[PDB]
Structures are given as C-alpha cells and as structure tokens.
Symmetry: none
C-alpha cells in the first residue's frame, strides 16, 4: 500500500502520466515568453555546459525570445560558456544546437581558486584532501551561478534554471524544465532537433518511479528509500 | 473584481502570508526562535551552523540566536557548534563589535576580495565590460554578497552543518523593490520579523544601542536596485506597512503595486 | 504532536487565523457578483429558513445583485420561504433583514408526503417509527433543494448554498460562506446589520478548533475524534 | 498565452483530468470497477447500495456492476446487498428488461409522479406559474430526475447503504452543455468512462444489443438544456473528442469553449 507516496511525489513534482514532445515544447516556450513579458524583462541567461539539460533549457529560451521578438517585444538570450580553466567540444556542440542570440565565455577558475585560497588562509581545514576537492566542486558550481546572475542583473534579465523532477529526486529564477523526467528532457531535445549526444540509483529507475510506468516492486521500494533518505 | 478589498485589508493578509504576527512579544519570540534552530539541527542530523557577521543588526541577531541555540543543544546533550564568519572585502569596526556581542564558539576570517575581483575581471574578459563607475559598483555589489554566501556554504559543507540566513519579512518586501538575491540560506531564524522587530529582539538579547545602529556597507549595498529612477522605499515604511500602523496612503499603495507584480510572476507557471 | 492535523484541516477547509467582518463582507459580495457575471447568469436563489446561516448568505447575495445592477449588469435575488405545511415569524424576521428583490413561498409538505407515501406503497419498511421520521426529515431537506433548483433553472440562475467550515465539520452551486466559522458567520451578519437573532460537540468547540484559538488539550482531541469519525 | 496549445493537446489533457485512459480493455475494467465498489463498501462500514434502473444502458451497467460487487463481497464473507429501484412516473418496457439483466438482490418499485406533480403544483402556487407547454416540460423534467434521487437516498438511508451513481466522463462533458443536475450519488463505478466505453463494458457483462440500444424518456430528458438556440452536441461527438479520435475541428473547438467556460467558474472563488 506504499504506492500511495510514489503517486503523491509525482504530483507534487508535477509529472504528468502522459507526454507529447511537440505539446510540451510549445507549452514551455510560451511559459518563458510570458514570463519575461509579464515581468518587463529584456533578457534571460543560461550556462551551457554541453549537458543535455542545459542544451534543452537553452534552446527553449532561444525559441522563447524569438517568439517575443516576432511579437514586437524586445528580448535576447545570452548563452554562457563557463569553463574551469583550459580544460570543450561538447559545449561547442551544444552551442551549435542552441543558436543563442549571444554567447559569452567566463572562466570561473580564478574566482574559485581565490575563494578556496582565502578559506585556507582563514583556517578552514579538511581531514582529507578528497574533502577539499568536494568543497572546491561546490565552489565551482556556485561561481558559475554568480557569473550568470552578474549578467542577468547588468542586463535587466533573469537566470534560467535546469531543474526538473528527475533532477530534484536524484541530484535559478525561471524553470522551463519543471515537471519533466530525464527521458522526457532527452525526447524534448530530440524533437527540437538535437543530434544524439547515486548509490546505484539510475535515471531510468527514477523516471519509471515518477512516470507511473509499472515497474518492479523491489526497485520501486528502493527509489522510495533514496528519496525519503533526502 | 466586483471585489475591491481595502488597502488595510490587503495589508492584513500579505502580513499573514509573510508570517508577521499581530502582536509581538520579544521575550518569547526569542525563546522560540532559539528552540527552532536547535530542533532543526537534531532533526536533520547536523552538527554545525554557520553565519557571516557583517556588523549589521540582522546578522548580529541571527548570530546571537544561533549561538544560544547550540549552547542549548549541548545542554540537551546533543553536541553541536556555531561558526561565525568575518568576511571582509579587503581592508572594519562594525564587524568586530558585532562579533564581541555574538560570542561565537568559533570565528573564521575569510577575505572575499580576491574572489570577488577575479569574478568581475573574468566577467569583463568575457564581455561584460566598459562598465562606468556606477555600473561596476552595482555589479561588484552583487558579486560580493554572493561570494560571501559561498564562503559560508564551504564551511558548512566542510563541517556537516547548515548556513544560517538573515531573511525576514521586511527584507522580503524590500526584495520586491530591489530584486537583490544572494542565493539563500538553509535555516531562517528571523523569518516573519519586520525590521523594528529584529531590533527589539536584539535588545532583548542584550544588544546595546550603538550595536543596533550599525550599518556596514555590505548591508547597505543590499538595499540598492540591480543596476543604477528607483522608487525609494525605507524599511520604516515597510515595517509600518506590514505591522498595519497608521501611515501614508500613497506609500502603502506603492507597496501593493510592487507586491502585486511579484505575486504574478510566481503564479507562472 | 497531533496539532498537525488541526492546522491541516483548517487550511483545507480554508479558515484564516484572523478575521475582519467589513473585509469579509466586501470580499464575499464580490465573489457572488463576479460569479453571476462571469457565467452570464441572471439570478440567484436561496431558501430563507430564519436561521442565521441562510440570513447571512442571502443578504450577501442581495447586496451582490445590487452591486451588479449598479454596474449595468442585470441580476435579481430570489428568496424562498419553504415551509412544511402550516407550521413562522422567524423567517419573516429574516426576510425583513435580507430585503430580497423577490420572495416566493413554496410548501414542500405535499411533495414530501407524496414521496414518503410512495416509498411505503413500494414496500420500503422501517424497523422503528423513529426511523421513518429520520427518513422524512431528509426527504424534506431534499424537496427544499428541488424547489430552489426548479426556480434557478427556470430563471437562468443558480442556487446559493450556506456551506461553511464549521458546518462541514459538524453537520448548492455558489457558496459565499465558504471558509467561515460559526461565530464568524454570526459576526458577519451583525456587521451587515442583523438584529440579534452533535454527540455533545458544540460550535464554540469547533470554532476554536478551526480557528487556532489556543484551547484545552482534551477538548481539542475530542473535536479531532469526531471529525475523523466522519 | 505566448502559449497556444493545439486542440489535440488540449484534448489530451482534459481527458486525463477526467480520467479517460488512453487504452481501454473492457474485461478488466470490469474486474476492477467491481472490486472498487466492494472495497468502498467495507472500508466505509456500509451494508447496502442502491440504484434506480431506468431501462437505459448506464444504469443497466452500473447496476449489474453493483450486483456483482455485492455478490463478491459476500464471498469475501462481508455481507451486503444491492437494491435496484424501478422508478416510474405514473403509467415501461425498457425498465423491466433492464431489471431482468441486472438481476438485483432486491427490487422496489416507487412511483415518483405523485411527488413530482405535487412539487410542480406547489411551485406554481408559489409563483413559478403560467408556464407554457415546453417551459412546464422542462421544469417537470428536472423535478422528476431529482425526485428519483430522493427515492434512492431514502432507501439508502433506511438501510445504512449508499446510492450508486451513473456519472461518467462523457456525461460530465454533456453537463457543460446542458447544466443538468440531479444532486449526485455516493459511489461512481462508471467514472472515467465515455459513452461507447460504457456500452462496451455492458457487452462484456453480457448485455445484448437490444438492451444496449434502449433509451428511456427519463434518460433522454437529462440531455436537454435547463429551459427551452442550443448547440446540439451528441455523445458520439463527445466520445470522439475525449478519446482523441479523428473528428470535426469546428465541433472540437465548440467543446473546448464549453469546457473553458466551466473551468473558470470553478476557479472562483
């Protein structure tokens, strides 16, 4: 009788039991468009990492600002490459798909290393070096968010987030991927025309869980454990 | 919309939304905000909390509350600690005095100027450039506030703790005007409070008036709009608004407009 | 740690922890007005029993149709006396307060007695006579609803209900008393200008429960029992 | 609203709202609608359920399902009974045949004409009067449907049972057009079904085609508007709509309008 939660989580996270990509694309392009218009905004901003989630969110946002400009409402989408130093063809590939109004590249390593260094000089100490790497990984992710806010604010714009339901379970201002599962993000991208680039918990298992797809009992119990354990 | 609620009615109502209570007693709001912090820590498993101490009264107050909460936890037997952070932007009297009042288990001083300056330069390298003195000021302002949040999260990460935040209801309303973000914290012991209520809480906690009055640049910068004309609201007008005190009608109408424009964007989806 | 439900029920039933009568009156008059307008309706309908709940709901509805007519939108409120035979000054008193556009009187006894009689002739049998009285009480209440729908339908109108939160707990189309407690219904009427006319569970106890008013522990436990037991 | 969802998309979506599944298998929708009725009864403590048998297929089907549910309950050991009601308006072949198919534990015949006629007269006495032949027809129509619901509730009251209802998704959509109410029932074993799906369920339950085809006046009256020009929708158009089958665009656009106008009034509050 646990199946009660599963369905309770999907609804709370907004996962619909059916999915049509065309329908969703249209809906989400409009969300973004209405949002910027209603709020009197002129731009939106997203870091493009080469990952499918930001590729998808970003293409929706480009299409949104294009739909607005057709409206007579002016708006631009600013794509950001945000490397940690000289590490990159995946993001370029993503860029070639997103086709953003603008692309800025901002190196976050100097800020991230300067923060780590100041922490140390300040007497923040780690039992293990691995722990320092974990701390730095999070600094990097946050520095990447700062760069995006910096541009959104200077430009009277907002930051796009890549949040979705599969992500909430497993793992900005405007979230056009809300309610989606992982395979549904992938399918939305495919239909927009993209090419074709945990504790043992997988996205398939999470997607099944959230999707109502009849799946093994044990496994389900498993996914519910991990989620509650968070 | 054949419905035309009175401004006083609209204020009621926003206030409940934000958790501003009709009456306020400082003595036991203190008692209860403490316990809240404590209970949250155990209930989560956490052993530490962290806060940047700016020299300004909200951080002084949230800070002191956190130090009393861990001091309590201990008594309950459940070990835990509070890390205050001093977070200068290079080379402050206000902060040192606040620290003296907070009396944290532990204080780390972390310079955010190198990180802040590096982010600004890399942004300019990347094309957010040819900023005039005020545009750079405004950009630098947000960066510094968010770099400070990064410092607190790192420590919190390192120590299996959480970041104490200073958010309150008056601050939320200010945010309708400014749109200043810093990313947020984990636990908000000042939630529901107005600006004068935070000051009253602090006096109950033993803060002296000089401490109450301190306004560091780091707090002042957060009251500015995103970029550099802006309707100038004061916290005193916001407090009067939320507390339902007699005040200026035009002023109160402005605040409604701003809350309205915000209420929508949250509707969308 | 049960206080969890109490607050959960009040929210689900829509009870606000504060209350201003003027504010509520205004809000509820507008609800009714918008409703009839948005739906292209021309009338609304309520049985006036002399009880405070229907007095209150009805006066709000009269004020609503008056606010619409000031708008240039035409609408009428039809008050109904619905006696069970020659039984009545309480309803007349209520009527004098409601001041409805129209008042119809419809005797429900003949329909109610004809239904009871047909049931009997049909072989519906009761172990006790008391049980027949209970069955008839419900027939009467339902016949009263039919009379109201009959008029709402013939007139392109709708039926006003008297539902509120205290009522849901303890015990139409448009419900202008939704979210209210019993003492708040009484206070709304007082301010509109009305004169001044269970298993041991009372309205005070329910109102306290739903209102967050700090009240005795036991009692609270009691009210929660009765509600769940339903 | 920079969002312009496709009609096919809008149909998807309404359909899920109403619980019309994408595929339908009659054999096990039957199995599962039965169990549902049963489990509801125990879970509530109830020992009886009741339904007016009109001669028409929705009541024939909901009826049969109820009789199998109690027959099951018994097996589960948990005693219970089904009371079918024949509810003539005075002085019908359709109903008697339906009853023969339902094979209820028990049947009561209750004449609703005396009650209906008494309500109409008292309404006229009270001022709903000088009705022309069609206005009286339309008024009488609602009264009769609701008097029938009263009969079922009385029995249900008397027997610590619940009233089985015939509501389904196609009926809900019809209601956007007609606005016909009867007050509702307690347990809706046909919920989520379209009109053709109810017919398919009935055939699975063993109904013969002649039974499937019967349309008593009592069912026909429920498809009319409140008063006596109305856009004429058919159940076949509604079914095509909800099931997402190829169909007329104009037609489907009408149905959207009507569902829209309804979606709002429910928003208000």
């Amino acid at each position: 009788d646990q199946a009660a939660r599963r369905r309770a989580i999907a609804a709370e996270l907004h996962v619909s039991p059916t999915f049509d990509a065309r329908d969703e694309a249209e809906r989400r392009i409009g969300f973004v468009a209405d949002y910027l218009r209603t709020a009197g905004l002129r731009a939106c901003v997203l870091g493009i990492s080469g990952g499918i989630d930001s590729s998808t969110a970003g293409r929706l946002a480009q299409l949104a600002v294009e739909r607005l400009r057709a409206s007579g409402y002016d708006a631009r989408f600013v794509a950001m490459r945000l490397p940690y130093g000289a590490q990159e063809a995946d993001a370029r590939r993503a860029l070639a798909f997103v086709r953003a109004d603008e692309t800025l590249t901002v190196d976050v390593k100097p800020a991230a290393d300067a923060m780590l260094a100041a922490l140390a000089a300040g007497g923040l100490a780690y039992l293990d070096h691995a722990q320092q790497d974990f701390v730095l990984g999070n600094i990097k992710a946050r520095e990447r968010m700062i760069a995006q806010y910096a541009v959104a604010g200077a430009r009277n714009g907002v930051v796009i987030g890549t949040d979705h339901a599969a992500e909430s379970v497993m793992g900005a201002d405007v979230l056009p991927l809300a309610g989606l599962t992982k395979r549904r993000v992938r399918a939305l991208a495919r239909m927009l025309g993209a090419d074709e680039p945990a504790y043992g918990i997988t996205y398939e298992q999470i997607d099944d869980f959230l999707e109502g797809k009849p799946m093994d009992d044990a496994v389900a119990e498993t996914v519910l454990r991990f989620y509650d354990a968070t």
